[PDB]
């Protein structure tokens, strides 16, 4: 019973950092215990009428506000010991075959891949939970709870209620455009991109008016892709809708065995494609790392040998990431029940 291994595939999930790429650029590493973000009101009271005699009521000069944040820490690790090395691996032929030493250099390689993938997932969820809602809380079994709370007005994060539900109202002879305008009226600055959720996009597209905005000779310049366009990728840069750019994002991260979706079940996120985003990386806290002279970096890798009876060569990567939103009122999140 000889054999041969013709093909050996590999499985993956849909993962692409859209939210991090579009809105979070210009990474700024820092060596500091805590960072500052400063907002200034900029509201100007109207110049009230005054008689030419009384000459009073001096006006206070406007003063801003600040905040302080502390970056979290994340450290995944793996292992390898002589026991796993001997038997075989599912990705080598029964023919060919290698010495035990090379199987270790392959196991370490796949361990590196998994570590970097986990860190990337943490960064992406870090970003997405910051875009959708103003605040996020980083919690863990051994990590003391610390939260980041950008100052977002309560009037954002608008959700639908017992009235004005898209699902309940009729799909013919109604417009979503007026509701979109009323929602986007809140955001400070122009809006240039909309990031749907596949169920939300399916709900939006089925309206009779939205089709009508597409096949009108002279009433619009919008063009979309109503039919099936992307089925396997995690992003879909569909056409523009008047002026804004339509995007549908379906990216998956795994917490426990199961697979979960980043965007929570048909949300819509108005936003600007040039939104000021901060990608802050803290200081890595490892004695050897500071021996080497490396600080305020991301993805510091290392390995060592544990001199125990079964040996073992561990493998570890440390990040300490923290994504900020300089202005949290340039986005408007809508639930779309």
């Amino acid at each position: 019973t000889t054999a041969q291994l013709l093909a050996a595939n590999e499985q993956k999930f849909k993962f692409d950092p859209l939210f991090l790429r579009l809105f979070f650029r210009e990474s700024y590493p820092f060596t500091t215990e805590k960072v500052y973000l400063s907002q200034i009101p900029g509201l100007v009271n109207m110049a009230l009428y005054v008689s030419p005699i009384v000459s009073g009521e001096v006006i206070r000069s406007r003063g801003g506000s600040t905040s302080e944040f502390t970056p979290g820490y994340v450290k995944p690790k793996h292992e390898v010991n002589p026991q796993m090395t001997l038997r075989r691996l599912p990705d080598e032929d029964p023919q060919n075959l290698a010495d035990p030493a090379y199987r270790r250099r392959r196991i370490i390689m796949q361990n590196m891949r998994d570590e970097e993938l986990a860190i990337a997932q943490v960064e992406e969820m870090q970003a997405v939970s910051a875009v959708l809602k103003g605040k996020y809380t980083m919690t863990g079994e051994a990590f003391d709870p610390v939260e980041v709370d950008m100052g977002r007005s309560e009037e954002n994060n608008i959700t639908q209620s017992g009235g004005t539900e898209w699902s309940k109202r009729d799909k013919s002879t109604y417009d979503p455009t007026d509701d979109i305008e009323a929602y986007a009226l809140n955001a400070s600055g122009v809006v240039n991109i909309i990031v749907f959720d596949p169920k939300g996009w399916a709900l939006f597209r089925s309206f009779k008016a939205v089709k009508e905005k597409l096949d009108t000779r002279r009433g619009s310049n919008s063009e979309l892709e109503t039919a099936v366009k992307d089925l396997g990728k995690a992003v879909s840069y569909k056409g523009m809708y008047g002026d804004v750019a339509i995007v549908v994002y379906s990216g998956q991260y795994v917490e426990n065995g199961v697979k979960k979706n980043f965007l929570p079940d048909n949300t819509m996120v108005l936003g600007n494609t040039q939104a000021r985003g901060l990608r802050t990386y803290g200081c890595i806290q490892d004695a050897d790392a500071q021996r080497e002279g490396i600080n305020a970096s991301a993805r510091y890798p290392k390995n060592w040998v544990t001199t125990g009876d079964p040996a073992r060569e561990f493998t570890m990567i440390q990040s300490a990431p923290l994504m900020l939103l300089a202005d949290p009122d340039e986005f408007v999140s809508v639930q779309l029940a």
Binding site: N96, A98, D99, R105, M112, E292, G293, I294, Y300, P301
Partner: protein, 472 residues
């Protein structure tokens, strides 16, 4: 193709080396390989001899400059080019072979020893770093000073798992070019904290700042590999065999005879070996005839041959080591057995081809780059003046202004007379010029002509017969 298969009878079913690039097969073991090579050089007779041969044959006792700017390309005119060459050569001669040794910041080596040490480092490390610095506080005419950096101190990014762009402590751009190197500090006491510094390869003005010299093997090679990876294991094993055989020979020769008896040891060695009880030493004078009772006995131990065919196996291993390193077998092993003239000449030619290749690459490139770095400083300081009406400035044509050639030490002839007759016969015909025949002996023709034209004047003035080369 049986080569890629299982093998003859399954003998090769376990030899499956990984298909990995040269970098992924060299860098993880770089420091240990360098350390083992150093240990071999410092503690083995033959490795030291090989390094000595490299230094003495490739470079020699003197490494003389020959400047030949390409005047046709620059359109500067022959006489101006020749005068500029003479001035540059005089300046270099005054700056390179000084006695105060100010070419090197450490003030320890002149130029010839710097070239020799560079070839040595390129021999057992496969690279060499020369750093060109400045000392503006100095009052000398030329403020450009060079330093030799050991390849150990060009450390990686502190040994951490590295990356694609930053490899082996040599920062790299999108292509294979190297932008900046990392230099450490060599602390002998061993307790000072280490500090790493960034030294860019080139200054913003185009001047060469930090020099790297090595010969690549494949598409991408950040750092080179020494000439010992071929034959370290056999060298160490041969050394262990030599020491073990020597110790075994000493042990076998130590025990001369063996006394077998029943009486007390003092009495048995008193009545047989001749030692007096007045352990017990035995006098070594005279001949002795012991008297043995029936119980007693004496045995004269015999030992094997001291060298029972060890020299032939040494011959085979030394032949392998010489084949790996590059030099001939006679030079490495000092054997020099019986051989005709043809065999010796073939040996010398086979060695000299490789020696010429190494000299033309490593020493020549290092010397040319150092000379250009000094020449820029000489030009700027108006110590040497360029010809006017130049088609290009010095910046626009770096090599053309200083396209230089170097002449090293020439071969020592096995037959003293045959080479002389060969040179004379070639000169009589038009096949080879005066420069080519004078350079094979490592002499410059212009100096020879000047020496002869003063010798003829001295002989004429002193009252002696005019020389052969004088023109009647």
């Amino acid at each position: 193709y049986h080569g890629g298969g299982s093998g003859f009878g399954g003998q090769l079913r376990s030899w499956n080396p990984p298909s990995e690039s040269v970098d992924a097969a060299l860098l993880p073991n770089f420091t240990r390989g360098n350390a083992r090579a150093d240990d071999l050089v410092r503690n083995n007779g033959y490795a030291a001899n090989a390094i000595q041969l490299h230094q003495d044959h490739i470079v020699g006792s003197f490494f003389r400059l020959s400047h030949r700017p390409s005047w046709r390309y620059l359109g500067i005119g022959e006489e101006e080019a020749r005068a500029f060459s003479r001035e540059v050569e005089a300046a270099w001669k005054e700056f390179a072979e000084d006695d105060c040794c100010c070419i090197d910041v450490e003030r320890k080596r002149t130029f010839t020893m710097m070239i020799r040490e560079g070839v040595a480092m390129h021999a057992f490390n496969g690279e060499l770093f020369v750093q060109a610095t400045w000392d503006t506080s100095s009052s000398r005419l030329f403020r450009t000073q060079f330093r030799m950096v050991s390849p150990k101190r060009i450390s990686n990014p502190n040994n951490t798992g590295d990356s694609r762009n930053c490899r082996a402590g040599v920062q790299i751009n999108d292509s294979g070019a190297a932008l900046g190197y990392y230099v450490s500090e060599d602390g002998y006491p061993g307790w000072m904290p280490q500090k790493w510094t960034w030294i860019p390869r080139e200054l913003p003005g185009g001047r060469a700042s930090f020099i790297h010299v090595f010969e690549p093997v494949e598409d991408g090679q950040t750092r080179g590999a020494n000439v010992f990876y071929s034959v370290m294991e056999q060298m160490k094993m041969l050394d262990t065999l030599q020491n073990t055989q020597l110790q075994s020979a000493i042990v076998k020769a130590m025990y001369a005879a063996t006394i077998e008896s029943e009486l007390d040891t003092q009495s048995a060695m008193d009545f047989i070996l001749g030692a007096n009880s007045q352990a017990a030493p035995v006098r070594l004078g005279g001949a002795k005839v012991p008297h043995l009772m029936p119980g007693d006995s004496l045995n004269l131990q015999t030992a094997q041959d001291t060298d029972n065919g060890y020299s032939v196996f040494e011959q085979s291993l030394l032949r392998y080591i010489a084949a790996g390193l590059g030099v001939s077998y006679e030079q490495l092993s000092r054997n020099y057995a019986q051989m005709s003239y043809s065999t010796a000449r073939a040996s010398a030619n086979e060695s000299w081809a490789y020696f010429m290749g190494r000299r033309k690459f490593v020493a020549s490139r290092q010397a040319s780059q150092m000379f250009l770095c000094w020449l820029e400083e000489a030009i700027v300081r108006r110590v040497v003046t360029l010809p006017s009406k130049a088609r290009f400035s010095f910046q626009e044509a770096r090599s053309a202004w200083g396209n230089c050639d170097w002449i090293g030490s020439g071969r020592m002839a096995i037959d003293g007379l045959k080479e002389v007759q060969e040179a004379v016969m070639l000169i009589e015909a038009g096949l080879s010029t005066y420069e080519k025949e004078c350079a094979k002996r490592g002499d410059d023709y212009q100096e020879i002509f000047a020496q002869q034209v003063r010798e003829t004047m001295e002989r004429r003035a002193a009252g002696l017969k005019p020389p052969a080369w004088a023109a009647a």
